Design a protein around this ligand. Structure first.
Ligand SMILES: CCCCCCCCCCCCCCCCCC(=O)OC[C@H](COP(=O)([O-])OCC(O)COP(=O)([O-])OC[C@@H](COC(=O)CCCCCCCCCCCCCCCCC)OC(=O)CCCCCCCCCCCCCCCCC)OC(=O)CCCCCCCCCCCCCCCCC
Ligand SMILES: CCCCCCCCCCCCCCCCCC(=O)OC[C@H](COP(=O)(O)OCCN)OC(=O)CCCCCCCCCCCCCCCCC
Ligand SMILES: CCCCCCCCCCCCCCCCCC(=O)OC[C@H](COP(=O)(O)OCCN)OC(=O)CCCCCCCCCCCCCCCCC
Ligand code: HEM
Ligand code: HEM
Ligand code: HEM
Lengths: 53, 292, 380, 445, 60, 49, 109
């Protein structure tokens, strides 16, 4: 996007912060399917299959 | 300047040089208060163009070969002019500055003119300094072989510290007595130290004490050149002052060549010379130069 | 003693924000407009409160309550038409405020600009639901069309539209919840305007030259106090000549018929300040494409501070970008004219070309022109 | 002439063991001077709160007269040869060291054999040094960093012998007797806890012969067979604050528990300290300093000074930062300091790690310069590690450190740990322990 | 053998993102388990009174 | 004197696994942190529900 | 520099009012009550807003709209009774807040 953040140090910072960002994305996805009660996701988890959701 | 002047003996040495010289050694190492906010870039350019010239510089290297150092010398240090500005020979005035600031400890320094760097007599003055005490040798010691400490300590029941001050510059010298004492007993400490130096000046000294002072001076020199920083400072000072490198064995040889009659002559030159005094603290009992 | 104006903790904020505030001495009449907007907001709220003491949000009685306001309440026609033409005056002052911000480079105050575009979205939503509120023919069919095109979002759109409706169509629950939301949003607009003023007051105002006006600032009182009072008086003159002389030149006649779900009007419009966006919404033959075109047509103001490629803040000394700006105002007026026209030849191709030109001038032509202008002054 | 073979060219420290078990170690150079010292594994950690000033009062009394050199004679023939005599006591070690010429090497050794073995502890001298120590503690009360580090030890090692100071409390100074000093000497001045170290112009066989002639047949046996042991000291996450608003500046130290001497992770932690570094108000770098903490402290005018420390004791230690600043900046300074720690836990890049490695290499090679710090390092090395670690081994341990294990070690010792906080001065804006403890972790990670 | 909260701190409770993931997963399973338990408790308190306990006589 | 101060006894308030001053920490800090953060996590789960 | 909590002009107001605000250490649970009032006010507003989504202010249908909220709107009985009992809770918290101000001499503000 910009030439200020291009280099090896910023690539190392991105590699450092990418598993934390992926874990936060997983947190957001689980929170989204928990709050919205998404049936296409929740009808494959074995314990909550009896909730009909 | 505030961090440097946080402790009193820096200001004492500054005031002592300002007392002792009219010019060319009485200029302060630290910037005066009015000159702050007024030093310009062209003054710095003028100072560098008149004093950072090729005939007044020595490049000294530890851990490098001569070829690399000489090729960066011919690639950098060839564009400057010559000998630069001369100087002003540092003539002597004497006098007294007393700075009443109400400290619990009175710091006093009484100095006189002595030999310069390169004179043999200055070496004798160095021996005289170690005859009188140039610092402790034991952490929390009594300074048994220090003549000034022995002369003052018999009449003092309260803390003090007395030493001999030596300062040799390329055209001048300053040898004297530094005292730190209480406010109420500054006069007796100063008078006892001055009487000790006067007794040294009248030929009352032991040859064993002169030998111990020589051993102290030799050990101090060899401990000063022990580290690499002190070694390179010594090499640079020798190259600037004399243009040659003097070996430490030759330095110890000319230290051992000093006679005790030369020490008596140095003490007599201090006693008969015109004095210069810088004092600070609660100076209600600190004596004057004519009262000594 | 003690200066009470600079020490009392309630009068200190009033002093710092309206009396001893250092303002640029050379700001033109355009800088009046935002204060006018605040006055219009208060006017709307006041008139809205006096509509709320007689309006009923029931589909059987909403049109009857509006006619009862116009015919039986003492000066109720005055308050109702003041409310409608004050919404129109609000959008006039809003468009001129945004045009001032675009022309003079005031978008570099980025937080103030973003709170502004949030305020603009809130004001548009408030005006839409308020126009739904009288439950005329035009109100019902405008709400139906807008929600039906909002249903274009995949996999959630039908559920979201039936959730907003509270039913299968636009019904009594929709009107009652629209009354509640139209009541409650102008107070959120007032709070967001307080945040807007705070984010401006961290840095002061811009001047038409675009330069640092720190060398020439004057107190806000009495200069801009009396200037804002004069602008308030002129805006009140235009509002009362809109209310007392031509009360229906900006509204639609078909809103004076009751809402018939069986009868559809031959031509469906929103009110005029939405119309250009409607044209953009119908410049693409795809429902999602039109919806995203409308959303980015409003959000391109938020994208605007990242497109500034010039070394000069204002357009006072930039003639090529001035020409491009007035072409942008020109085809905004063209899109406003197309939005009120039916979808036949040549309105379709004119609206498509106008939308393409609008997005290309804002996105492409102005930064390239700013680069060229920097090249002409031997800066680039 | 590369760095690796230059570190190979350093002479090897030669170590021998006498019959009574005292170590004799020497390193030879071409200097005409030498430093000969005796290191004893004794300190305030070995005291049981009734003789808390004993080692300090003995190092005051050590140079004031022995049995064969009574009174001021020992002064006379230590300074007739120009030698310098020094002594110090830490919480775990005691050192008596002499700087002298090489040709005076035998006499100096027996002077050391006259000091740690045949000290005469006269009662009027005990009274004089009791008064001297009382007013010297009164002098030390006005140095704020000593007070802050003593407070940090006292709040970090509560209930353990590591909390108490080397000087001890003033009441113990008032009531120590001669018998307690003799008991301390006969308990802790044992031969298997003594290293005779020498550096400079010292011949090792001559030093070994002189140690055999002078330092033999001493101690080696506990008289009641009451062998002492060094118990581990519990670290306590806690805070002490001494608020006194009349002081002009405020000193704050924040530390966590270190790993100890034997853990190699210290090397990695030292590199971490080299990333944060130190700053003082007389530094010439200004805003262009490589340390982000020092750069933001210059740019925001926050601190008078800051420094980082890694103090190590036997399987324990304090790893942290000390800063002096005015009151109105204190909390802000803490914030930036904690941010740097979390950066070293999460986002350490290779450039700052390489800079810290170069800084650590230069620091240790520059510290090992002269006979006195080399002999000092020899004494601590044989007291702590049991051996003198060569400088090439230090370079290998530095060069094996990269950004990944620096992040791992910094996360293990820093992230989500309870610190010890000591504050002195106008410390009203010093934040709460809850706020500091919340600042010791990141919600974004 | 380490204590169970020590293992939970070493695996899940150390990083804040893993803390949030553990909170979310526990929220799903806790919601399901508490819904089952509370419904069972309420139905056991009200046996024979609810419509779901008597609807089999009228489903014909 | 600044060496005259001493932290008083906190053993009435301390946990059982940090009560002994002759044993180290860091083999029980993870258990204490896990207990406190388990309390916090269960509170967060209930509030989220 | 990066101390946004005390440099951002919006965030410094929340900081100065709720995070770095110096409060007395010894205030009892009575000092909770005013904060409860604010939260209770928010609750009232929220419940009232949803109660405004189905209520008609017409004398022929106000009671009918209240019964329609309590019977036909999903959890509308919950919203209505939370609104009424939250009005009662608001007045309980007002009485205890005023009593704290009377007892502890807080009227000097
Ligand atoms: C043309 C013939 C007269 C003439 O030559 O006048 C010169 C005069 C300009 O003289 P100048 O010395 O060159 O400029 C200095 C101004 O006079 C200095 O005054 P100013 O123009 O800066 O005044 C502030 C500004 C303040 O204007 C506002 O506040 C306007 C607010 C926005 C408009 C209302 C909102 C709604 C818009 C809906 C679209 O007022 C005006 O622009 C004119 C106000 C007229 C009031 C009624 C007079 C009868 O012209 C005008 O003022 C134009 C208007 C009057 C004619
Ligand atoms: C109508 C008349 C406009 C007019 O007179 O424009 C010229 C005027 C020149 O002013 P300026 O360039 O600052 O220089 C002062 C003289 N040297 O320039 C101005 O007065 C600048 C006016 C700026 C605001 C114009 C707003 C017009 C309406 C825009 C609506 C759409 C906004 C974008 C929506 C998306
Ligand atoms: C209420 C029931 C009794 C509560 C109780 O036990 O009160 C005693 C308590 C003592 O508090 P204190 O005197 O500060 O002593 C602390 C030393 N341990 O004293 C208090 O807690 C005093 C504060 C009580 C405030 C609430 C009680 C009054 C509520 C009604 C006030 C109505 C005001 C007027 C409203 C209409 C106008
Ligand atoms: C909180 C303050 C407000 C209240 C209580 C309020 C209330 C009302 C009510 C009861 C009506 C229906 C009566 C009528 O038909 O005119 C109405 C209509 C309307 N309101 Fe508001 N309003 C408020 C603020 C606003 C604002 C700020 C705007 C501008 C964005 C606005 C725009 C409209 C419009 C366009 C109509 C339709 C007028 C028409 O029938 O032609 N209202 N409002
Ligand atoms: C809800 C309607 C709005 C109100 C009440 C409002 C209020 C104000 C006020 C009182 C000012 C200060 C006086 C002035 O400079 O005119 C102002 C300035 C400003 N507003 Fe708004 N505003 C509104 C809408 C907007 C919008 C939609 C934007 C974004 C496009 C915006 C961006 C700005 C900017 C950039 C300034 C700074 C003016 C400058 O220094 O040049 N405002 N506004
Ligand atoms: C702006 C926010 C509010 C709105 C929109 C609102 C709206 C309403 C509405 C529509 C009703 C009639 C429904 C019903 O009878 O339950 C109502 C009832 C009521 N409201 Fe509010 N209200 C608000 C805030 C408050 C506040 C702050 C209080 C005072 C604590 C309050 C006290 C009451 C009471 C006592 C009733 C009568 C409850 C009953 O008898 O059923 N309301 N409100």
């Amino acid at each position: 996007m910009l030439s200020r953040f291009l280099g090896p140090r910023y690539r190392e910072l991105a590699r450092n912060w990418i598993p934390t960002a992926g874990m936060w994305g997983t947190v957001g996805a689980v929170g989204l399917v928990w709050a919205t009660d998404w049936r296409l996701i929740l009808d494959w988890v074995p314990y909550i299959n009896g909730k009909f959701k | 300047k505030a961090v440097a002047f946080q402790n009193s003996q820096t200001r004492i040495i500054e005031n002592l040089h300002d007392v002792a010289y009219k010019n060319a050694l009485a200029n302060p190492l630290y910037c005066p208060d009015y000159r702050m906010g007024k030093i310009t870039s062209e003054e710095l350019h003028y100072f560098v163009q008149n004093h950072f010239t090729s005939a007044r510089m020595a490049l000294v290297g530890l851990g490098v070969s001569h070829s690399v150092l000489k090729q960066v010398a011919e690639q950098f240090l060839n564009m400057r002019g010559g000998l630069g500005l001369a100087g002003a020979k540092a003539k002597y005035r004497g006098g007294e500055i007393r700075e009443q600031n109400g400290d619990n400890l009175v710091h006093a320094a009484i100095v006189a003119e002595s030999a310069a760097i390169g004179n043999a007599e200055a070496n004798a003055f160095s021996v005289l300094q170690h005859l009188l005490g140039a610092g402790p040798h034991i952490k929390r010691g009594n300074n048994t072989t220090s003549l000034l400490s022995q002369s003052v300590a018999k009449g003092s029941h309260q803390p003090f510290d007395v030493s001999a001050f030596n300062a040799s510059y390329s055209d001048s010298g300053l040898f004297g007595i530094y005292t730190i004492s209480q406010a109420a007993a500054a006069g007796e400490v100063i008078n006892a130290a001055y009487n000790q130096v006067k007794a040294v000046a009248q030929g009352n000294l032991s040859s064993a004490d002169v030998q111990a002072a020589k051993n102290k001076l030799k050990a101090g020199y060899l401990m000063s050149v022990e580290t690499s920083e002190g070694f390179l400072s010594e090499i640079g000072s020798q190259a600037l002052a004399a243009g040659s490198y003097m070996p430490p064995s030759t330095v110890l040889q000319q230290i051992d060549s000093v006679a005790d009659a030369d020490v008596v002559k140095a003490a007599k030159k201090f006693v008969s010379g015109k004095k210069s005094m810088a004092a600070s603290g609660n100076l209600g009992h600190t004596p004057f130069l004519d009262e000594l | 003693m003690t200066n009470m104006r600079k020490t009392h903790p309630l009068f200190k904020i009033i002093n710092h924000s309206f009396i001893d505030l250092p303002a640029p001495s050379n700001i033109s009449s355009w800088w009046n407009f935002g204060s006018l907007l605040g006055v219009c907001l208060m006017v709307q709220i006041i008139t809205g409160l006096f509509l709320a003491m007689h309006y009923t949000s029931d589909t059987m009685t909403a049109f009857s309550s509006v006619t009862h306001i116009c015919r039986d309440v003492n000066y109720g026609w005055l308050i109702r038409y003041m409310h409608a033409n004050g919404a129109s005056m609000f959008f006039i002052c809003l468009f001129l405020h945004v045009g001032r911000g675009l022309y003079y480079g005031s978008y570099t105050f980025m937080e103030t600009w973003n709170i502004g575009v949030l305020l603009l979205f809130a004001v548009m939503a408030t005006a839409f639901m308020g126009y739904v509120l009288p439950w005329g023919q035009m109100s019902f069919w405008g709400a139906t069309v807008i929600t039906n095109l909002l249903s274009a979002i995949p996999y959630i759109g039908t559920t979201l539209v039936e959730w907003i409706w509270g039913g299968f169509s636009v019904d009594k629950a929709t009107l009652t919840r629209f009354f509640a939301f139209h009541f409650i949003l102008p107070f959120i607009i007032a709070a967001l305007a307080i945040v807007h003023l705070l984010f401006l007051h961290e840095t002061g105002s811009n001047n038409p030259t675009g330069l640092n006006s720190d060398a020439d600032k004057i107190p806000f009182h009495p200069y801009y106090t009396i200037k804002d009072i004069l602008g308030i008086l002129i805006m009140f003159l235009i509002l009362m000549t809109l209310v007392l002389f031509f009360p229906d030149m900006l509204g639609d006649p078909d809103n004076y018929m009751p809402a018939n779900p069986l009868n559809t009007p031959p031509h469906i419009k929103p009110e005029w300040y939405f119309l250009f966006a409607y044209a953009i919404l119908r410049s693409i033959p795809n429902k999602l494409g039109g919806v995203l075109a409308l959303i980015l047509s409003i959000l391109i103001l938020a994208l605007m501070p990242f497109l500034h490629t010039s070394k000069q803040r204002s357009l006072m000394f930039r003639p090529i970008t001035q020409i491009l700006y007035w072409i942008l105002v020109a085809n905004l007026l063209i899109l406003t004219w197309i939005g009120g026209q039916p979808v036949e030849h040549p309105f379709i191709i004119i609206g498509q070309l106008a939308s393409i030109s609008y997005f290309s001038i804002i996105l492409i032509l102005m930064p390239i022109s700013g680069i060229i202008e920097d090249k002409m002054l031997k800066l680039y | 002439a590369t760095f690796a073979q230059a570190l190979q060219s350093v002479p090897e420290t030669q170590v021998s063991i006498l019959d009574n078990g005292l170590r004799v170690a020497s390193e030879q150079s071409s200097h005409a001077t030498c430093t000969v010292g005796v290191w004893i594994d004794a300190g305030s950690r070995y005291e049981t709160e009734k003789n808390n000033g004993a080692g300090y009062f003995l190092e005051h009394l050590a140079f004031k007269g022995t049995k064969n050199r009574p009174g001021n004679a020992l002064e006379k023939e230590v300074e007739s040869i120009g030698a310098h005599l020094n002594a110090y006591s830490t919480r775990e070690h005691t050192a008596y060291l002499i700087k002298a010429l090489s040709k005076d090497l035998p006499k100096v050794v027996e002077l050391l054999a006259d000091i740690v073995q045949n000290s005469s502890l006269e009662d009027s001298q005990i009274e004089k040094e009791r008064d001297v120590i009382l007013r010297e503690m009164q002098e030390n009360d006005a140095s704020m960093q000593n007070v802050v580090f003593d407070y940090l030890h006292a709040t970090a090692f509560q209930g353990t012998p590591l909390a108490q100071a080397v000087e001890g409390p003033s009441e113990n100074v008032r009531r120590l007797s001669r018998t307690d000093l003799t008991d301390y000497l006969n308990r802790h001045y044992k031969a298997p806890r003594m290293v005779l170290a020498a550096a400079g112009g010292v011949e090792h066989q001559q030093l070994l012969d002189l140690a055999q002639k002078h330092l033999s047949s001493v101690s080696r046996v506990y008289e009641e067979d009451a062998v002492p042991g060094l118990t581990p000291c519990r670290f306590t996450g806690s805070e002490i604050r001494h608020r006194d608003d009349a002081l002009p500046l405020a000193h704050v130290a924040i530390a966590v528990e270190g790993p100890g001497w034997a853990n190699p992770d210290n090397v990695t932690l030292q590199v971490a300290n080299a990333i944060i570094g130190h700053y003082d108000c007389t530094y010439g770098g200004g805003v262009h300093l490589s340390s982000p903490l020092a750069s933001v402290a210059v740019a925001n005018k926050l601190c008078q000074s800051f420094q980082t420390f890694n103090i190590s004791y036997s399987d324990t230690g304090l790893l942290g930062a000390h800063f002096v600043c005015d009151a109105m900046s204190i909390d802000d300074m803490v914030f930036f300091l904690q941010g740097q720690w979390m950066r070293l836990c999460t986002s350490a890049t290779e450039s700052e790690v390489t800079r810290g490695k170069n800084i650590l290499r230069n620091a240790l090679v520059s510290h090992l310069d002269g006979t006195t710090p080399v002999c000092e390092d020899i004494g601590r090395s044989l007291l702590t590690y049991g051996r003198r670690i060569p400088l090439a081994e230090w370079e290998s341990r530095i060069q094996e450190v990269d950004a990944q294990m620096l992040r791992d070690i910094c996360s293990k010792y820093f992230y989500d740990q309870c610190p010890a906080v000591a504050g002195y001065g106008p410390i009203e804006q010093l934040p709460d322990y809850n706020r500091i403890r919340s600042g010791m972790f990141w919600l974004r990670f | 053998s380490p204590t169970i909260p020590s293992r939970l701190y070493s695996l899940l409770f150390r990083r804040t993102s893993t803390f949030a993931l553990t909170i979310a997963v526990g929220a799903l399973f806790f919601e399901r388990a508490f819904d089952q338990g509370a419904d069972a408790i309420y139905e056991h308190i009200n046996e024979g009174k609810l419509w779901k306990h008597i609807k089999h006589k009228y489903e014909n | 004197s600044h060496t005259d101060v001493k932290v008083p006894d906190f053993s009435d308030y301390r946990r059982a696994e940090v009560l002994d001053s002759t044993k180290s920490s860091k083999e029980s800090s993870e258990a204490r942190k896990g207990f406190s953060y388990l309390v916090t996590a269960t509170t967060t789960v209930g509030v989220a529900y």
